[PDB]
Amino acid sequence: FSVKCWLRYIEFKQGAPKPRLNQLYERALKLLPCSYKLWYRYLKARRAQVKHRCVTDPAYEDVNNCHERAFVFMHKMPRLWLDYCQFLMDQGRVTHTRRTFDRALRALPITQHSRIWPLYLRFLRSHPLPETAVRGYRRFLKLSPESAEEYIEYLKSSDRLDEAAQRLATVVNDNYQLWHELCDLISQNPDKVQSLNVDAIIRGGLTRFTDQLGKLWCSLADYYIRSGHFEKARDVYEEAIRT
Amino acid sequence: CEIQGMLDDKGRVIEPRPNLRGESRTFRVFLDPNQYQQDMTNTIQNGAEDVYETFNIIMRRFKAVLETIRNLMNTDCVVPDWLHDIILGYGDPSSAHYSKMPNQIATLDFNDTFLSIEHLKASFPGHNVKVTVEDPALQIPPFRITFPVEAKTLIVEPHVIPNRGPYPYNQPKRNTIQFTHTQIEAIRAGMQPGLTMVVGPPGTGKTDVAVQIISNIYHNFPEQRTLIVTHSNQALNQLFEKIMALDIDERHLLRLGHGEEELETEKDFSRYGRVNYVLARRIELLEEVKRLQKSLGVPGDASYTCETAGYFFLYQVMSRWEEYISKVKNPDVTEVSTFFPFHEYFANAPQPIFKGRSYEEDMEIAEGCFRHIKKIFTQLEEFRASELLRSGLDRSKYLLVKEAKIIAMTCTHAALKRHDLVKLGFKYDNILMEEAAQILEIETFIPLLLQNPQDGFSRLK
């Protein structure tokens, strides 16, 4: 029951490393997980050894090693998983994201939040389904008022204004308000010049957050150079003179 | 005056009335939501005389409609582009159906109506039934049924509803009544985008068609919502009685009413009784996850709640499950039996679920048991709202707006309490309704304002 002999059987295991990993997981989950560093360095050296071969059986044996090293749960089958998610990012197949997300959440801590959410970010690239779907599920998932804020600020960077406004709605329903203002300005860039979106974003932002005439006069110049000349503009500019 | 009762010894309306001393009666009533609203309008805005307080006598054997008209008219009134035209008649009236909305279900779940694939081969009499594989000992599934847009083949492929663990109690519920051919076409014309009015002659089972629609919509959309609306309470009561034999969890069922109503079916869907039953089910999920924790073999002397239960599930059960995953998908019939620490958990269950002979069958069993403990943690996710909602009516609204995808409502009742429903979760992605001619045009269009548009477009499908 010496961790010495355990690491020795692991690092002397030759031939196919599959009996290596199976007997390793057996003994390691049999006795205590004090060999943590041994199995960790072993997994890294094994990546050096087999990373040129098929990613099927070696990466499977490694994931098994990590989940079995996780006796119950621990702070390195997760932090190590965050590193694992970073490696399992040049995928070519999103099953890596799906399965690794579980390694990130082998608990439910500050860990793998910033591994999944930027993973949704690199999911939003040319397919907005995972972006907006993870946005919805995370807004209605493990509670944190900052995650949905980050979701609005993430959909702010991709061309789906509905996802930004959706996270904004969720958070305002239940910095975050200022970030909603930033996303409102981002979708209020002068592209939809029908003169509706920027004005309504001004009203919603200046409703959830209070600026003393600053953003008010910003929206004033916007809507008054976007206003008309008839009764509509007469009344709009009069109302702005009065308010 | 919708009377609750007369005066008693303690001046309260009846609900065994007390010792009725004398021949006077002073009874309170409440006719409708907008009962003290027309007289309010007359006394406040038109300054005219009193109607509800000029009383003379009482005799035995509306404004809610007018308020609904005012609201629906002065809101955006953005209707579904396939039903506003079919409501104003302008536009070819064969258009609101499936064959004229472009996004037909490519392949939907035609599961319930068919329980024998030969029965389905008969019930598809004008399409070339293209059933995938040719063992009739292998084909009676909840098949996938693509009808294409050659162009008339019923593309039926087998499917296998995934496991739920070792236990033979949750044998997933499939229908029993082999509804008609045009009736299955009714179910499909309802479950695909558009409009559908079923001409149900006496005895044909329009309510059976409705139960089929509930089932098929809960199949082909796990997330979108179903408003099942009636003219009288008979529809909702009978359709609940019928769906009591389908694949619905009682965390997905709820209703509305017009005030006081006594439960017409077997089990309560009502507000307080439902919150109480779901509290009992939450106890079930808590004790389940906790005995599963003892199966995992950790120490600890006090018990936890919903939040810690979900986090602990993802922390322990998911970790062990990733271990078993990286042992099984990295994998012998020996390890598909052994390498699951669910031996102490399914040690309160029938004989070991990994049969030790067929590795893939043992895999189905193991993933079904893990997903069953995940459904324990998932009903814990649902009881998050039961533990976050403070009151009985509060938890009713929370559990109907959040998870209950099937809300059964009455016509005048929902026309009266639509605003509260809009504000606290009126989700109308699909409508299933009964007693069609038993309503009016008003009681058919007043529900059309249960919401506000979604970036210039309505919630209807």
Secondary structure string (H, E, C) spanning B261-317: CCCCCCCCCCHHHHHHHHHHHHHHHHHHHHHHHHHHCCCCCCCCCHHHHHHHHHHHH
| A102–B318 C-beta distance less than 8 A | yes
Q: Collect all residues with Cβ–Cβ distance below 8 Å to A239 and sequence separation of at least 6.
A: none
| CA B316/CA B303 separation, integer angstroms | 16
Q: Kindly report the backbone phi and psi dihedral angles of residue A24, in degrees, each rounded to the nearest multiple of 5, phi listed first.
A: -60, -50
| CA B314/CA B320 separation, integer angstroms | 10
Q: How many CB atoms lie within 10 A of CB B84?
A: 18
| A142–B315 C-beta distance less than 8 A | no
Pairing state between β B253-255 and B406-409: parallel
The dihedral of CA A85, A89, A93, A97: what is its sign?
positive
Closest CA to B392 of B268, B304, B284, B289: B268
Q: Kindly report the backbone phi and psi dihedral angles of residue B4, in degrees, each rounded to the nearest multiple of 5, phi listed first.
A: -90, -30
Q: Output the CA–CA distances (angstroms, integers) from residue A238 to A198, A220, A227, B278, in the order listed.
A: 21, 11, 12, 57
Pairing state between β B226-229 and B430-433: parallel
> Which residue ranges of B are tagged as binding site for ATP?
178, 183, 203-208
Q: How many CB atoms lie within 10 A of CB A103?
A: 27
The upper half-sphere exposure of residue B99, i.e. CA atoms within 13 Å in the direction of its Cβ, equals 5
Residues from chain A contacting residue B294 (CB–CB below 8 Å): none
What is the DSSP annotation of B210-260?
Answer: HHHHHHHHHHH-SSS-EEEE-SSHHHHHHHHHHHTTSS--TTSEEE--SS-
CB B287 within 8 A of CB B345: no
B310 touches chain A (CB under 8 A): yes
> With left for phi above 0 and alpha for psi between -120 and 50, is residue B194 left, alpha or beta?
left
| CA B146/CA B142 separation, integer angstroms | 13
Let me know the angle formed at the C-alpha of A224 by A223 and A225, rounded to the nearest 5 degrees. 95
Resolution in A: 4.2
| CA B106/CA B23 separation, integer angstroms | 71
Structure tokens given for A171 = 């958070």
Residues from chain B contacting residue A72 (CB–CB below 8 Å): 296, 298, 316, 319
Let me know the angle formed at the C-alpha of B224 by B219 and B225, rounded to the nearest 5 degrees. 100
Provide the residue count of chain B.
461
**DSSP tag of B50:** -
Pairing state between β B144-146 and B153-157: antiparallel
CB A29 within 8 A of CB A71: yes
Q: Where do the DSSP E strands lie in B50-201?
A: 108-109, 128-131, 144-146, 153-157
- Provide the residue type at B404 as one letter: A
B325 touches chain A (CB under 8 A): yes
CB A67 within 8 A of CB A82: no
Q: Which of A64, A102, A107 sits opposite B327 (nearest CB)?
A: A64
> Which string of b and e fits B400-432 if b means at least 16 CB within 10 Å?
bbbbbbbbbbbbbbbbbbbeebbeeebbbebbb
DSSP-based three-state secondary structure for B148: coil
Looking at the DSSP assignment, which residues form a beta bridge with residue B407? B227, B254
Report the residue of chain A nearest B314, measured CA to CA: A107
Residues from chain B contacting residue A56 (CB–CB below 8 Å): 330
> Which string of b and e fits B3-17 if b means at least 16 CB within 10 Å?
eeeebbeeeebeeee
| CA B21/CA B191 separation, integer angstroms | 60
| CA B138/CA B122 separation, integer angstroms | 18
**Per-residue three-class SS string for chain A:** CCHHHHHHHHHHCCCCHHHHHHHHHHHHHHCCCCCHHHHHHHHHHHHHHHCCCCCCHHHHHHHHHHHHHCCCCCCCCCHHHHHHHHHCCCCCCCHHHHHHHHHHCCCCCCCCHHHHHHHHHCCCCCCHHHHHHHHHHHHCCCCCCCHHHHHHHHHCCCCCHHHHHHHHHHHHHCCCHHHHHHHHHHHCCCCCCCCCHHHHHHHHHHHHCCCCCHHHHHHHHHHHHCCCCCHHHHHHHHHHHHC
Looking at the DSSP assignment, which residues form a beta bridge with residue B228? B408, B432
| B330–A61 C-beta distance less than 8 A | yes
Distance separating the N- and C-terminal Cα atoms of chain A: 81
| B319–A70 C-beta distance less than 8 A | yes
A68 touches chain B (CB under 8 A): yes
Residues from chain A contacting residue B321 (CB–CB below 8 Å): 102
What is the DSSP annotation of B117-138?
Answer: HHHHHHH--SSEEEESS--TTS
CB B119 within 8 A of CB B178: yes
Report the residue of chain B nearest A161, measured CA to CA: B455
DSSP-based three-state secondary structure for B93: coil
Q: Output the CA–CA distances (angstroms, integers) from residue B461 to A212, B101, B144, B243, B312, in the order listed.
A: 43, 10, 21, 22, 39
Could you say which residues from 89 to 118 on chain A have a Cβ atom under 8 Å away from some Cβ of chain B? 99, 102-103, 105-108
Structure tokens given for B289 = 């996850």
CB B338 within 8 A of CB B270: no
The upper half-sphere exposure of residue B17, i.e. CA atoms within 13 Å in the direction of its Cβ, equals 14
Q: Collect all residues with Cβ–Cβ distance below 8 Å to B130 and sequence separation of at least 6.
A: B153, B154, B155, B156
Experimental method: cryo-EM
Looking at the DSSP assignment, which residues form a beta bridge with residue B164? none
Q: Collect all residues with Cβ–Cβ distance below 8 Å to A230 and sequence separation of at least 6.
A: none
The torsion of the CA quartet B245, B250, B252, B258, rounded to 10 degrees, works out to 100
Distance separating the N- and C-terminal Cα atoms of chain B: 39
| B325–A108 C-beta distance less than 8 A | no
